[PDB]
Amino acid sequence: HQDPWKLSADKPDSNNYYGETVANGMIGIISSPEPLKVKEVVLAGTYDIYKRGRVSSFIPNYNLLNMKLAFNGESVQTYNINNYKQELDMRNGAFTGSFQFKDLATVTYSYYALRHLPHCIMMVVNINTQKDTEINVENLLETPSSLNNQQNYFQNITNTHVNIPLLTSVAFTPTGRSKIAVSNTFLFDEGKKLQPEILHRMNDADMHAMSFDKKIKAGKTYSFALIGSLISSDHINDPYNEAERLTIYAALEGKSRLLNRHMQEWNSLWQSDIQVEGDPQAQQDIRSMLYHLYSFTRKSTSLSPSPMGLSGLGYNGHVFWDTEIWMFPPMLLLHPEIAKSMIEYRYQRLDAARKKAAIYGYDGAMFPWESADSGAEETPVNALTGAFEHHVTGDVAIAAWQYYLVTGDKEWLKEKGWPILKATAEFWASRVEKNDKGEYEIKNVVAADEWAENIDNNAYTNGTAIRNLQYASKCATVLGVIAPKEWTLIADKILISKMSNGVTREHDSYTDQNIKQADANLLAYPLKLITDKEQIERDLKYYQTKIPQSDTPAMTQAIFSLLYSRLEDSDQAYHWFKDAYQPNLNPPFRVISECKGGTNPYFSTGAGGVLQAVIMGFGGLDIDAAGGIKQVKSVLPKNWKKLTITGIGIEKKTFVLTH
Amino acid sequence: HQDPWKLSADKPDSNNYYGETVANGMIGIISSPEPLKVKEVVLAGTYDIYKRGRVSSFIPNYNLLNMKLAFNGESVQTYNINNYKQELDMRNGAFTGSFQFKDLATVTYSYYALRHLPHCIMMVVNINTQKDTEINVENLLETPSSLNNQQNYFQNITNTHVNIPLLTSVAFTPTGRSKIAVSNTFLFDEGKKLQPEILHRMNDADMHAMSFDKKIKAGKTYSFALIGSLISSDHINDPYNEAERLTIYAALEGKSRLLNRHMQEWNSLWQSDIQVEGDPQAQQDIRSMLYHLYSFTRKSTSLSPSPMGLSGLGYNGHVFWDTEIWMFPPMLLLHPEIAKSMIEYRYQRLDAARKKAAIYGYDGAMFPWESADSGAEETPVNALTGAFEHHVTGDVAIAAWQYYLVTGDKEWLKEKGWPILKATAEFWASRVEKNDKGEYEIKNVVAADEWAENIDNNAYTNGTAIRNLQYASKCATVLGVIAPKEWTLIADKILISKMSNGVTREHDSYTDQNIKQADANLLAYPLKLITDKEQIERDLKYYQTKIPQSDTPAMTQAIFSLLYSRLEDSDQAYHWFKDAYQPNLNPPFRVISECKGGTNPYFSTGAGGVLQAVIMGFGGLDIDAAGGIKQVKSVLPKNWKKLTITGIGIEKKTFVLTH
Ligand SMILES: OC[C@H]1O[C@@H](O)[C@H](O)[C@@H](O)[C@@H]1O
Ligand SMILES: OC[C@H]1O[C@@H](O)[C@H](O)[C@@H](O)[C@@H]1O
Ligand SMILES: OC[C@H]1O[C@@H](O)[C@H](O)[C@@H](O)[C@@H]1O
Ligand SMILES: OC[C@H]1O[C@@H](O)[C@H](O)[C@@H](O)[C@@H]1O
Ligand SMILES: OC[C@H]1O[C@@H](O)[C@H](O)[C@@H](O)[C@@H]1O
Ligand SMILES: OC[C@H]1O[C@@H](O)[C@H](O)[C@@H](O)[C@@H]1O
Ligand SMILES: OC[C@H]1O[C@@H](O)[C@H](O)[C@@H](O)[C@@H]1O
Ligand SMILES: OC[C@H]1O[C@@H](O)[C@H](O)[C@@H](O)[C@@H]1O
Structure with a gap:
């Protein structure tokens, strides 16, 4: 049952069966x-x-x-x-x-x-x-x-x-x-x-x-x-x-x-592929992850996947930041035309995001927490995320700018990226509040750690605002258009606080609470606002035990894996790689549930994160701030003899890694 | 009953009456x-x-x-x-x-x-x-x-x-x-x-x-x-x-x-007119053709006529290549603002053509066989033309390019012509299949001769794809854009085959079948892919007896007439001119039915073809590949003493022809 291309089931058992x-x-x-x-x-x-x-x-x-x-x-x-x-x-x-x-x-x-x-x-x-x-x-x-x-x-x-x-x-x-x-x-x-x-x-x-x-x-x-x-x-x-x-x-x-x-x-589609020597179960699992992302997306469209793709009615088929931050990055590196469809989804819904911003008292475009046909907010009203989880606007801006960094398509940047970046920056410029010290706050949000509700200065949210404002200013420079100077002034003064131990504070009310998922660690990857390796490590050490085993979604351990690969820690990187998805599998085809021991496959979001741990972590591949794909230092799992990643970037480069 | 401006009926007979x-x-x-x-x-x-x-x-x-x-x-x-x-x-x-x-x-x-x-x-x-x-x-x-x-x-x-x-x-x-x-x-x-x-x-x-x-x-x-x-x-x-x-x-x-x-x-409208001396019946008939096209079109709109205009429910009021190839050319020469409305109809429906292309697995814009309000396919599902008669996409491209050739409107070309030409070329580039010999095929179509269904390399279809790719490439050059080099490589190698007698083969399964209407002869006019006068004549000789008398629409003999005028054969040109519409007339106003002896007037498509036989055939007027209207060698019927055509081209030129 370790065929690198085929998932087989002998005598399907209807009492324990999750379809593919x-x-x-x-x-x-x-x-x-x-x-x-x-x-x-x-x-x-x-x-x-x-x-x-x-x-x-x-x-x-x-x-x-x-x-x-x-x-x-x-x-x-x-x-x-x-x-x-x-x-x-x-x-x-x-x-x-x-x-x-x-x-x-x-x-x-x-x-x-x-x-x-x-x-x-x-x-x-x-x-x-x-x-x-x-x-x-x-x-x-x-x-x-x-x-x-x-x-x-x-x-x-x-x-x-x-x-x-x-x-x-x-x-x-x-x-x-x-x-x-x-x-x-x-x-x-x-x-x-x-x-x-x-x-x-x-x-x-x-x-x-x-x-x-x-x-x-x-x-x-x-x-x-x-x-x-x-x-x-x-x-x-x-x-x-x-x-x-x-x-x-x-x-x-x-x-x-x-x-x-x-x-x-x-x-x-398979001209972009990942080949692992020394671990047939990892080879098969990674092929399944690519297979699901390729099956649940479509080039040359304005389609975007739900967290469960087309595997069922998971999260009502709605589009979340699961696309921009979790499924989009691996697709941008392997098949930029799939990433183009994902950001086209948002471009064609920019008017609905402008209408949401105006209804909630802000400027620019406020993308919804959950999107469907119109691009209006679709989150169930009993979920406070719909009203208060605002980082999705910055997540859309980050994916738009990354699309341009990887493709270098300045015509796309003029026609589609800049409309998104300008309107989302206008949202954040209206969403911040300047305090007596001249600092900029973002008050009363739901954090990326969604267990933290109606709190102030969430690390991940504030980081996405900083990146949105910086990337909109950079975009204006590229196109020769004058951006408001306020965007840089705000980006440079948005609060990111540390606790007394030097650890990034998740939000203003945060001490040692359990967290639902990665939040402060996301400032290291994907945002790269934290580059100091000692700071990356102190944040990992404090937060990695804060995610409970039960009822926590597959939006954490893949990031831990990637950050430990970047720190060249092979044992911790491989520990977190396996933890990210092996405890979430369902028989007989090893489909992926949202949470450990869950029964709601297929969580495409989870596959996207693990593909980042493989491509950006074990492979060291990185979206360069100056443009294009670069490779940083990485380590492989002990038992992996060779990692080959094909079809990367607009030049369709092959990367081979060994010990 | 030969008033050049009036059609009269004494004592309308309700047992044999076709209204005007x-x-x-x-x-x-x-x-x-x-x-x-x-x-x-x-x-x-x-x-x-x-x-x-x-x-x-x-x-x-x-x-x-x-x-x-x-x-x-x-x-x-x-x-x-x-x-x-x-x-x-x-x-x-x-x-x-x-x-x-x-x-x-x-x-x-x-x-x-x-x-x-x-x-x-x-x-x-x-x-x-x-x-x-x-x-x-x-x-x-x-x-x-x-x-x-x-x-x-x-x-x-x-x-x-x-x-x-x-x-x-x-x-x-x-x-x-x-x-x-x-x-x-x-x-x-x-x-x-x-x-x-x-x-x-x-x-x-x-x-x-x-x-x-x-x-x-x-x-x-x-x-x-x-x-x-x-x-x-x-x-x-x-x-x-x-x-x-x-x-x-x-x-x-x-x-x-x-x-x-x-x-x-x-x-x-009548500042553009056709005057015939020596044939009062032809003068009245040609005035009726102009009158119907003028009545069934409207400058400064996005309206396009059905094959029956506003004379009834013929073909459900749908828009076909009957506009682009049959009614559009005479209107472009006499009243470019009418032709502008006809191509505006397609420009407005470009997004629906893109949607059709994606549903049928192609790139670019795939115009429907039959169009109505949305621009989606409207053909009855029991007619295989809706699924398989693809030349309509090239017909729209040819009309768009001709509009630019006659008007020289580069602003229109940038805003409307190029969107059409680029998207329709992308369709053909995705529609062809390269064979082992490096030739390009267009497999499994319904021919312009619609009696040939699910055949390969239809002469007219392949010719329209060649012209669409060539004209899109020329359009890019006018606008200072580099067209994909593949468009020219494909255009130069699309198959147009000859039989052993040197006659253009209608499709890969064609030997000597009866045909519904002009197909291979359309490569001579309107496409002008065949210019060699001996090849034009060989093709006329083989195909002119292949169109049966019964159940064949008025989309053939006007082309034969025009081609014989261009060959300076007055007797054959006039034979085919009369045959094109006189056997299709209904009393008491000499309205035109679709087929010989038919009873479904008014077939505006038929009038459009005959007006081309008069203007482009007898008058020798031609859309110059380099821009503008030129005059080529022509002949008049024996009995026509003078042909005067007024209001031609953007300079509103009068042409007078005599023996
Ligand atoms: O997968 C959809 C949503 O599921 C929730 O469990 C997570 O907290 C969100 O970050 C995610 O967007
Ligand atoms: O769909 C409503 C809500 O469901 C919760 O389980 C998720 O954690 C939220 O991200 C989502 O907005
Ligand atoms: O931990 C799982 C729980 O997380 C919360 O953030 C969501 O609002 C709940 O819908 C979910 O059941
Ligand atoms: O009602 C229409 C008429 O209105 C008058 O006020 C004008 O003087 C006439 O020229 C016009 O025909
Ligand atoms: O007039 C509508 C349609 O009628 C059919 O008889 C012809 O074969 C088509 O070429 C034409 O478009
Ligand atoms: O309207 C359905 C079909 O009717 C047939 O008579 C015509 O020949 C086709 O061109 C048309 O698509
Ligand atoms: O029906 C589809 C078939 O049509 C034929 O006319 C072509 O020669 C085949 O290659 C094609 O597979
Ligand atoms: O010859 C007339 C016949 O031509 C065929 O191509 C059409 O499909 C029929 O609808 C039509 O009656």
């Missing part, structure tokens, strides 16, 4: 332990009021691949199959199930969230019979309880060459905000004259199905595909017609052309 | 054989799901001019009038009916889609008595079956000088997408104190009416006008109040000022 995801940045499909079923389907960009939080949410969508297979009238059941296995191929995001039905036949099924077609899915089914048999195949479109006012359609699209039978459903999100359309077809090898007749049943209010029978003779393979398209009014004004049009398009492209394009785009 | 249209580019009114009625009214820019195709459509609207006239209680009908005539004056788009009622009176009515007021219509009624009579006049607002949830209102707008009685209806398109308002008034010469009292009746669910009586002594003229405004929520947020405001405005402007402004704008 295939996704193309638009649709996520989460696996079921049951053969020929999927557990959950999530469509990006589609939000409505639904369950948690009384705010916008991702919606469970049509389980569009659900299929029933029968041999001579006997349905495939977990109790009448053997040699049942599931495999995720991380090289192409293929999820494959395989089993033997009694003594009769072997079945394999592989499904894909097509990498080049954001709204299209395909499953290919192969049946090898040891005896003459007849299969009955049914594809079910069950309207999930999350949707309402469904309609169930079926028709034949014909010409002299084809009969494309379309199984289509159209339904609405809870408040009617979004119309969803799904359209499925069966694609056969044998041609219009020889293909099986497709029957349509509409027996339930919330389910219809299409079906066929096929005779297969002993020693023969029969293979067919199910193609589906899933799209909403958030993506296209006419999703009903666009879903049918897409499935017709995909059917006439054919299985070979679809899979070739899918494979080409996955091959391109 | 008056339009201002916003409202079209199609004539009825019945006196004082109209058959159909169409409003541009208003689309909803309705009948054909299960996609957006134009909607039949209020027949707002419908009137009932009675003389001494006797209802005027087809059956009890004599000397009944209808006439379209193409000089000012006036449709006039005239008849005698027994021994009592002569009636004339003229209606207009006011050229300067997009949402306003007027009809003027004149009654000239031979005996004492009393008239009853009723104007009916019948909600058509295409609309729902109507409300029927009536009120008096008064001051010391006027009583403006308003007959208003408000209703909704089938899905509720669009609110329509119509508001009518009667305008009287005699003033407030003496004008007839207006009654209002609401006797039906779907009809209300306003009416009056008037005594007219023998040997007197009594005239009045009906003014109506028709507008939707697609045009204005509050159509109900805007319709009443417009009708009040028009009533207080008055008939003389309205008709004077109408006349001035029509006079300006």
Whole structure:
């Protein structure tokens, strides 16, 4: 179970099973332990009021691949199959199930969230019979309880060459905000004259199905595909017609052309890769982390991932600083075009951030703690983070400036980076309060350590304000535009306090409280406001035991690992690397939960942080303040013989590290 | 019946009658054989799901001019009038009916889609008595079956000088997408104190009416006008109040000022004209073609015509390459501001084209096969053209570049042309596939010859991709930008293949199939990729007999005519000119149907192609690759003594051709 490209599960156990995801940045499909079923389907960009939080949410969508297979009238059941296995191929995001039905036949099924077609899915089914048999195949479109006012359609699209039978459903999100359309077809090898007749049943209010029978003779393979398209009014004004049009398009492209394009785009993604010699379990784990970030993002878009990407409804699908600080940096180094989509999300929501600032009495752009379709605040009102956790505005500015440092794209800086940096700096200039001593305070926030609520001069928040004001001033200089001199005057005098032991104080009321997650240590990395190695170490020594084992998210130990790598402490760096994610794993595919012993995978945020510990920590790679990627001193884990990182920066550099 | 400015019908025969249209580019009114009625009214820019195709459509609207006239209680009908005539004056788009009622009176009515007021219509009624009579006049607002949830209102707008009685209806398109308002008034010469009292009746669910009586002594003229405004929520947020405001405005402007402004704008349109000496029928036919293009377009807008303009619901009012390649070129030469509106339509919809490209797995802008309000794909899903007929993207690029070549407007090129040319070139660069020989293919399209479906390397499609990439590269140079070198490398190696006889092969599976319409011949004109006169002729010889007589649209023979004019073959040029439209005519006004012997006028696309045969063929006028309009060698039909074309290019040049 240490294949560097594949995650395998023998005999899935429904009593202890956390499904894996295939996704193309638009649709996520989460696996079921049951053969020929999927557990959950999530469509990006589609939000409505639904369950948690009384705010916008991702919606469970049509389980569009659900299929029933029968041999001579006997349905495939977990109790009448053997040699049942599931495999995720991380090289192409293929999820494959395989089993033997009694003594009769072997079945394999592989499904894909097509990498080049954001709204299209395909499953290919192969049946090898040891005896003459007849299969009955049914594809079910069950309207999930999350949707309402469904309609169930079926028709034949014909010409002299084809009969494309379309199984289509159209339904609405809870408040009617979004119309969803799904359209499925069966694609056969044998041609219009020889293909099986497709029957349509509409027996339930919330389910219809299409079906066929096929005779297969002993020693023969029969293979067919199910193609589906899933799209909403958030993506296209006419999703009903666009879903049918897409499935017709995909059917006439054919299985070979679809899979070739899918494979080409996955091959391109894996040109940026991390290779570890001496630790096959670490190699597999790091490939899973890259696989999830690549699956949960999309170049050449304005999409940004939620903390759980497309693995489910984690945090309602909202966008947080989890993108800017946790998932964005590794993607900026490996695939700047993915980072460009993440910051495009924020650029296209700058007007909503300006509206939030004005509603809360500030200038400029105040990005929300949680973002969804509009870019307005989406945080549940019972969570004080929505009203008071203000560092997200500085986190967006830091990612925008980093995008420019790595790419050197001055046209992007003029058109998109500067609008963001100028407006966010204007926010901080309005948010600070000057005291009698001439110092600038940021009073009454929720800290990055969210257990500290309604406190003053949070280390991380104040640091993000300092960096936002400095980076906006630097940006103005690059573009030849005059910045307010007040931005530098404020940045230079924002309070960062030390306790009597010389340790950075997390906030004005802080002595020795347990903390939820890294806060003061974030001034060392990522902010690099603390560079003195003795100060980095004294802050690590004080705070590293302040994070409890229980109910603390994977947004801490990866930073500890990275800082200890930068201090050239191999034992502590590797200790914190393992602690960052191994206590958070779920079987049978080692998906990552938010907290230690948690059961809510997949926490993409956690993977992003650990990828920083590998690339920026063990690899020593750094976003240079002057521009480009540089390498600083680092150490490898004792047991790692070689670390190779490919596709880094706009020059696509390879870095090799050894002992 | 060969008046060069007027189309006349004596005794309209309802068993064999195709109405003529008056339009201002916003409202079209199609004539009825019945006196004082109209058959159909169409409003541009208003689309909803309705009948054909299960996609957006134009909607039949209020027949707002419908009137009932009675003389001494006797209802005027087809059956009890004599000397009944209808006439379209193409000089000012006036449709006039005239008849005698027994021994009592002569009636004339003229209606207009006011050229300067997009949402306003007027009809003027004149009654000239031979005996004492009393008239009853009723104007009916019948909600058509295409609309729902109507409300029927009536009120008096008064001051010391006027009583403006308003007959208003408000209703909704089938899905509720669009609110329509119509508001009518009667305008009287005699003033407030003496004008007839207006009654209002609401006797039906779907009809209300306003009416009056008037005594007219023998040997007197009594005239009045009906003014109506028709507008939707697609045009204005509050159509109900805007319709009443417009009708009040028009009533207080008055008939003389309205008709004077109408006349001035029509006079300006006819400053660009085509005069033929020696063929009165050709002179009238070509005037009708110009009249329809002028009626179905509007300068200073983002409107683009459907293949049937505002003559009805042909092709659901969708915009196709029928604009860019067929109606756009003659308008660009005669009235560049009309062509500007046509390409503005596409510029405004560039973001929807980018969204289509991303949904179908391509880069840049992929214009839809059929466009309506949003710019998303609107093609019925059972038509494979929507998914696979890709040349439309190159057709939009070619029109954008031609607009710049004719006008030399570098400001327009920077703001609008280049956005289009850059995005459409990015699409083609992503659409091609390089083969082992280093050639570029465009695989699996529907050809311009739409009878060839899901074939490879269509001649016309590949030619449009070549031109799009070349023109985008030239555009970059005008603006001092370095185009991606890949655009030229791809353009120079896109496959255009010949068969063994040296004839341009229509597609990779083509031998000798019948074809729907011009495809390979379009490489000679309009693309001018084929300039060698022997190659042009070889291609004409092979393909000219491949277009069947039946069910083939008017998108072929005008090209044949133009190419034979350019080859200086007068007999063949004139043969194909006549064949292009004379077999497609419908009585009694010689309107043009789509196909030979068809009954679906008015096919504005057909008129556009024929006008190119006249201007670019017989007139030899050509868009110079280096900029401006040039004249190449041409011939006239034997029987044409002189061809005069006025208002050509930004210099408004007159060209005279003789034998
Ligand atoms: O249907 C898709 C297929 O279309 C054919 O016309 C092309 O030659 C194939 O390469 C392509 O895979
Ligand atoms: O992952 C979403 C959020 O989860 C919370 O547990 C953390 O305290 C936040 O920093 C994070 O943004
Ligand atoms: O979604 C509401 C809140 O949930 C809490 O569990 C997280 O710690 C906050 O970051 C979040 O804003
Ligand atoms: O420690 C986990 C807890 O952290 C708090 O910051 C959040 O507000 C809670 O929603 C969460 O359950
Ligand atoms: O109502 C329109 C009329 O208004 C008068 O005030 C003007 O003198 C006329 O020129 C005009 O035609
Ligand atoms: O006029 C609309 C469409 O009609 C079809 O008959 C032709 O094949 C197309 O070229 C044309 O765009
Ligand atoms: O409107 C659907 C289709 O109708 C067909 O008759 C035309 O040939 C196509 O160009 C069009 O896309
Ligand atoms: O020849 C006319 C036929 O041409 C085909 O290309 C279209 O798809 C049909 O809708 C049309 O009736």
